[PDB]
Amino acid sequence: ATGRTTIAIDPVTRIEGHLKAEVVVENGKVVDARLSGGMYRGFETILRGRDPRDASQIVQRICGVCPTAHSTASVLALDEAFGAKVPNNGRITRNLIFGANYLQSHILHFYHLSAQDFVQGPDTAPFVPRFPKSDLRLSKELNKAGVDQYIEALEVRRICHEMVALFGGRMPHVQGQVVGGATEIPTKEKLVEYAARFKKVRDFVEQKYVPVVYTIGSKYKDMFKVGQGFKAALCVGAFPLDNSGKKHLFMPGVYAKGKDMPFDPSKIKEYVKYSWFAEETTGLNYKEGKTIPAPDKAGAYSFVKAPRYDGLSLEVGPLARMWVNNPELSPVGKKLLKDLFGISAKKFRDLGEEAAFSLMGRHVARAEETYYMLGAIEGWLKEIKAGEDTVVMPAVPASAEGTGFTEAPRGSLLHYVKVKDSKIDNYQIVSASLWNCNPRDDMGQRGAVEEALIGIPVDDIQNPVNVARLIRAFDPXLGCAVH
Amino acid sequence: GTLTGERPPVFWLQGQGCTGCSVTLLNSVHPSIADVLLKVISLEFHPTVMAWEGEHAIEHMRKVAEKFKGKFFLVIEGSVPVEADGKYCIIGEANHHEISMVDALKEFGPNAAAVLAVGTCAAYGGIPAAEGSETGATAVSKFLGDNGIKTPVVNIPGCPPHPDWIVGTVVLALDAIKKNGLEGGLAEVVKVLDSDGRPTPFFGRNIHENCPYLDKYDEGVMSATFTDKVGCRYDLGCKGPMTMADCFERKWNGGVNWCVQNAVCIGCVEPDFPDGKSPFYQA
Numbered sequence A: 001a002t003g004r005t006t007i008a009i010d011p012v013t014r015i016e017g018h019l020k021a022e023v024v025v026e027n028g029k030v031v032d033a034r035l036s037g038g039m040y041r042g043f044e045t046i047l048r049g050r051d052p053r054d055a056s057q058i059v060q061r062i063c064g065v066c067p068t069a070h071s072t073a074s075v076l077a078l079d080e081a082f083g084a085k086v087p088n089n090g091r092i093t094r095n096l097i098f099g100a101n102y103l104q105s106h107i108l109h110f111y112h113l114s115a116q117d118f119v120q121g122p123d124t125a126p127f128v129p130r131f132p133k134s135d136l137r138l139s140k141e142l143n144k145a146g147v148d149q150y151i152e153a154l155e156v157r158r159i160c161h162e163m164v165a166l167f168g169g170r171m172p173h174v175q176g177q178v179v180g181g182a183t184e185i186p187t188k189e190k191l192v193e194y195a196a197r198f199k200k201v202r203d204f205v206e207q208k209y210v211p212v213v214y215t216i217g218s219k220y221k222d223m224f225k226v227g228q229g230f231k232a233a234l235c236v237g238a239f240p241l242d243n244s245g246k247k248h249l250f251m252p253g254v255y256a257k258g259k260d261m262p263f264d265p266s267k268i269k270e271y272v273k274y275s276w277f278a279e280e281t282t283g284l285n286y287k288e289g290k291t292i293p294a295p296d297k298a299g300a301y302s303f304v305k306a307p308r309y310d311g312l313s314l315e316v317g318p319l320a321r322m323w324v325n326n327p328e329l330s331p332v333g334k335k336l337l338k339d340l341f342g343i344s345a346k347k348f349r350d351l352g353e354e355a356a357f358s359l360m361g362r363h364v365a366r367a368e369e370t371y372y373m374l375g376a377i378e379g380w381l382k383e384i385k386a387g388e389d390t391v392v393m394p395a396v397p398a399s400a401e402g403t404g405f406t407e408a409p410r411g412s413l414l415h416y417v418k419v420k421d422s423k424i425d426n427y428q429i430v431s432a433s434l435w436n437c438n439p440r441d442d443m444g445q446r447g448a449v450e451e452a453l454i455g456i457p458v459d460d461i462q463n464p465v466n467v468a469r470l471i472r473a474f475d476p477x478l479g480c481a482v483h
Numbered sequence B: 001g002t003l004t005g006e007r008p009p010v011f012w013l014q015g016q017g018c019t020g021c022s023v024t025l026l027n028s029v030h031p032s033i034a035d036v037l038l039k040v041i042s043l044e045f046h047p048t049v050m051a052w053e054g055e056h057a058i059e060h061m062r063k064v065a066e067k068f069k070g071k072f073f074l075v076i077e078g079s080v081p082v083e084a085d086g087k088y089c090i091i092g093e094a095n096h097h098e099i100s101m102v103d104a105l106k107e108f109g110p111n112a113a114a115v116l117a118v119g120t121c122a123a124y125g126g127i128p129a130a131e132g133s134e135t136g137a138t139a140v141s142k143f144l145g146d147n148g149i150k151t152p153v154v155n156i157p158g159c160p161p162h163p164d165w166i167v168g169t170v171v172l173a174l175d176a177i178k179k180n181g182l183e184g185g186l187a188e189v190v191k192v193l194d195s196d197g198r199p200t201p202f203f204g205r206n207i208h209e210n211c212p213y214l215d216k217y218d219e220g221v222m223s224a225t226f227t228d229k230v231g232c233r234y235d236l237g238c239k240g241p242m243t244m245a246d247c248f249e250r251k252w253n254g255g256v257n258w259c260v261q262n263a264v265c266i267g268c269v270e271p272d273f274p275d276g277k278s279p280f281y282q283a
């Protein structure tokens, strides 16, 4: 009954960094999309020529929301390149530093970035003005719970950063992770301080956050029926659970076209036809990666490269990790799925592919993962040994290479470093929001979020709220995506 | 403050930033960020946290800017890249026209009461301007000066700054303005800035000269591994001797740690950060 309207949103707000989204709407649904990351810094060229140890500080400034992820990938790459053997206690200390920021980041994302998609805030900036028809469906009581929890979450996320800083030095931008381990041995006194804060975070996650996501979701059941995209996911593994390098809290895997497959990093290639980089650099694996900006190149529309896995366009993040790993659902989630949705479920995949790979499914996965991380942190607090050394001091090699793989809160992250003459010769980063928020590849295949926008409803072109609601479900940070 | 009190309008523009300067502000303890937003300032535009989006958000800022011409505070997070006609940082689109960071600072800069350059990137160029970069990343004060824009600038550096430096500089300026009016108040703020534009309450003291490990430094007792917390950190790369900040006293994240106790100072508040403070892990 209606024809085409083309809608551009720049800036997309309540994400990190600079994003423009342009969608084509026909007859009340998105039928095409383009995502543009509009800010570039060029960390991969800034890093060249430096002492390799400097990387684990420089890279964190890619992104002040997820700096511990970049710190982790960098020190793992440097560990491999230097032949540094991280002491067991340092491995655990790193997990305590990084794990605390998963809690911070997911809480920040749901409450301070996403919740205004569903909750009306107080009648003052930055909560007004907004779309006249914002599709805010909650009762007065449940809306007030959302506001009260937004306000409480400001304190809880701050406490999470105190947890990071206890062994990490400060946050944003930790000092405490270096090649060879962690710079500060946990003391019994500071482990008491970490645990006391962790208890408050646990209580908020269990009693407020996980319940509110399912409860708000139960008022937006239509949002489990849209945003599927390719239904294809990547996990590269994260949080080593022993010193073998073989066992991780999140195990690696790929899922696409209804099938689980192994992860082989040699199958990653970064395309640039639709990205502002020199054409000769298209199609490179990260071990041979090149970063040559071309901001005037015709046809390109983003500073995000287009990563593909054996030609596939994949998404990353909590949904990806929880789908690939299929853990048990939280006790809260099981109960509320039954009570509010009529769903009997034990493990994450019991949601089914369609509901999991959806706008609201991504919010649910992130809340479930936050609960899952509580158990991991509790385990590390039992495993850590107060007073036991956490670092070795390795000499800088003249010639070496290394790759660090981990999972940032928003999805898979790797850093690759090549050292020559004791300096950085190349440094290549393939980050989480790169996998999600990238443009088309050289064959014209859309990025994960571009594809997940297809089918999104826009029944009111003057209040097209579901376009950015879909984008926010992926928790984008364009600083990470572009670097 | 109160929910019903006077709260001046603030626009927060991100150039080549990492959002760490916003995140550090969210960590403010006293006052909390909720109190800052609801009782101290009116944060009218901020892309990370505001309700509206896209052209509508830009137009809202423009409407407030016209109503409060000469009176709003402009926070800049990140550097301003000038190469390629501004194309390395596009911040919005309105009227089918892209808005670069260059464009935005030329538009709003002349009409702000003051520009607060938050973080080392905005204050001095920082990592985006460091060796190996190619975007023409420029500090706020230099960009404004090059374009004939005379609006006062206050630098609040750090990578990131401590929340107390950001909130405290706002409190200092608003107090001066309450006592003296806008022009008289900003004149009182300028009087307490150092030669790098930093407020001396926070940046007027050297880390090393106030460091708890200074006796170890003077004795030549140097830690050989990061986890030795008895010795001085100089041989491990500490830049405390060249760094002007009060971290030794207020510390970080609710007082739970700071860079020198945990590892080393990297001189993150200094105009030559990072290149003049690198390599980080040797003297």
Ligand code: SF4
Pocket (backbone or CB within 6 Å): B207, B208, B209, B211, B212, B213, B214, B215, B217, B232, B233, B234, B238, B239, B240, B241, B260, B265
């Ligand atoms: S070099 Fe660093 S650790 Fe040593 S006394 Fe100076 S500021 Fe303190």
Ligand code: SF4
Pocket (backbone or CB within 6 Å): B158, B159, B207, B243, B245, B247, B258, B259, B260, B264, B265, B266, B267, B268, B269
């Ligand atoms: S101790 Fe040094 S590196 Fe740490 S915040 Fe202070 S000035 Fe920056």
Ligand code: FCO
Pocket (backbone or CB within 6 Å): A063, A066, A069, A070, A408, A409, A410, A411, A412, A413, A431, A432, A433, A434, A476, A477, A480, A481
């Ligand atoms: N989380 C996070 Fe940052 C992103 N995207 C990385 O990697």
Ligand SMILES: [Cl-]
Pocket (backbone or CB within 6 Å): A065, A066, A067, A068, A069, A070, A101, A102, A105, A408, A409
């Ligand atoms: Cl992180």
Ligand SMILES: [Fe+2]
Pocket (backbone or CB within 6 Å): A044, A305, A428, A429, A430, A431, A482, A483
């Ligand atoms: Fe990259």
Ligand code: NI
Pocket (backbone or CB within 6 Å): A016, A062, A063, A064, A065, A066, A477, A479, A480
């Ligand atoms: Ni990030």
Ligand SMILES: [S]
Pocket (backbone or CB within 6 Å): A016, A063, A065, A066, A410, A476, A477, A480
């Ligand atoms: S992020």
